[PDB]
Design an enzyme around this catalytic site. Structure first.
Site, PDB file in Angstrom:
ATOM      1  CG  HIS A   1      -3.790  -3.271   3.321  1.00 13.97           C
ATOM      2  ND1 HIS A   1      -2.773  -2.852   4.140  1.00 13.97           N
ATOM      3  CD2 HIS A   1      -4.383  -2.170   2.825  1.00 13.97           C
ATOM      4  CE1 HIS A   1      -2.751  -1.505   4.123  1.00 13.97           C
ATOM      5  NE2 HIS A   1      -3.678  -1.081   3.315  1.00 13.97           N
TER       6      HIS A   1
ATOM      7  CB  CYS B   1      -1.075  -0.141   1.041  1.00 18.14           C
ATOM      8  SG  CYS B   1      -2.291   1.191   0.821  1.00 18.14           S
TER       9      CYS B   1
ATOM     10  CD  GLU C   1      -1.249  -5.555   5.701  1.00 15.11           C
ATOM     11  OE1 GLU C   1      -1.254  -6.102   4.535  1.00 15.11           O
ATOM     12  OE2 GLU C   1      -1.355  -4.269   5.877  1.00 15.11           O
TER      13      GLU C   1
END
Length: 245
Positions: A189, A97, A191
């Protein structure tokens, strides 16, 4: 001994501290394997590794940020200088990002507000297969598309000349890209998860930054489906640790 540095360009949110113990843990759960040493640096608060210690790391990861990768705050300038140094060392850096955008900026690209507006949702990205070797960091059976959580206001508006686009979407030409063999960047993302997303949505709604209907549409994208999390772990880990299936 394998060592990885995480550059945390974001503070820990209330939800993330209480649920996971902070973004250190979130990143380590996502990209870590048993036995490795992970050191994190809160670059957003001006806390960086010494230059003379960059050589001992096998790879680096730059997180997302609530800040913009086009800003000129001192910690961002220092981050850009450090990334340049790591890049010249040809060490591996995975940018997520904000990190995707910092690496682009270091390499001459332009980052700014997304042409088609912000994204807060589970989305899908289309893989440019004619840029992916079978068996490599993407591996054998490259899918046509991959589901990832999007949470951003900015994009790479002018891509460095040295970059190869690995994935796009209808509204964003650069969802994933690589530079040489040591830089790999993802706009979304890997994660994140549904819980983190829903918490961001609720909180930005409560601030009055989005409409109720936007929030509702954002959440509806994850009512019945999640991201391709295992696939992301595999890709990111293959890249970052130089594994090849």
């Amino acid at each position: 001994q394998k060592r990885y540095a995480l550059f945390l360009a974001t503070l820990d949110s209330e939800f993330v501290k209480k649920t996971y113990g902070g973004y250190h843990n979130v990143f380590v759960t996502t990209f870590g394997d048993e036995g490795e040493h992970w050191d994190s640096f809160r670059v957003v608060s001006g806390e960086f590794p010494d230059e003379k210690d960059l050589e001992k790391y096998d790879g680096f990861v730059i997180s997302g940020s609530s800040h913009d990768a086009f800003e000129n705050d001192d910690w961002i300038l220092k981050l850009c200088d450090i990334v340049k140094k790591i890049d010249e060392m040809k060490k591996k850096i995975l940018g997520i990002c904000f990190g995707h955008q910092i690496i682009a900026r270091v390499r001459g690209g332009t980052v700014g507000r997304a042409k088609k507006g912000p994204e807060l949702k589970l989305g899908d990205i289309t893989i440019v297969k004619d840029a992916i070797t079978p068996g490599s960091y993407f591996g054998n059976e490259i899918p046509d598309s991959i589901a990832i959580i999007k949470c951003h206001q900015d994009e790479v508006l002018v891509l460095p000349e040295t970059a190869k686009v690995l994935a796009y979407s209808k509204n964003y030409e650069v969802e994933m890209y690589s530079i040489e063999d040591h830089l790999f960047c993802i706009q979304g993302h890997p994660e994140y998860n549904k819980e983190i997303l829903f918490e961001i949505v609720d909180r930005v709604l409560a601030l009055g930054y989005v409409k109720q209907e936007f929030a509702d549409a954002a959440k509806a994208t994850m009512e019945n489906r999640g991201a391709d999390r295992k696939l992301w772990e595999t890709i990111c880990k293959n890249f970052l640790k130089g594994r090849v299936p």
